[PDB]
A = this chain, B = another copy of it.
Amino acid sequence: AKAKTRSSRAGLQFPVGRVHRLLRKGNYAERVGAGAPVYLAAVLEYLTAEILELAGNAARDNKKTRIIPRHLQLAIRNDEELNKLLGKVTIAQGGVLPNIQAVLLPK
């Protein structure tokens, strides 16, 4: 019997066995169901893809082919939902979103 990874059986790219192992040895519950690692890996993959889409768009807007922490910070702070998700998070070497109050602008 050829070994077929659970991620391939679920169509995911994140590991299902690793997430299952972390759930089992994370002291979360006495038992862990079969579909919980699949669901959690799918959710984590979705969130990762969602951030990487906007980060790549921001990198392309700066004529850059690589993603740096500035692009991740711009992507997260420009999207309302991601900014709400990570409102209490500091990103190393991310800077701040360029916002100047209208009062401070020249008369």
Contact = CB atoms under 8 A, between A and B. Distances in A.
Interface stretch (A24-32, A41-49, A60-68, A86-94): A24-32
A29 B86 CA distance: 29
| Prevailing SS type, chain A contact patch | loop
Nearest to A26: B27
**A-B pairs, 4 with minimum CB distance:** A27-B27, A27-B29, A27-B28, A27-B30
Interface centre among A27, A28, A29 (most CB of B within 10 A): A27
Contacts of A29: 27
Contacts of A27: 27-30
Contacts of A28: 27
Nearest to A29: B27
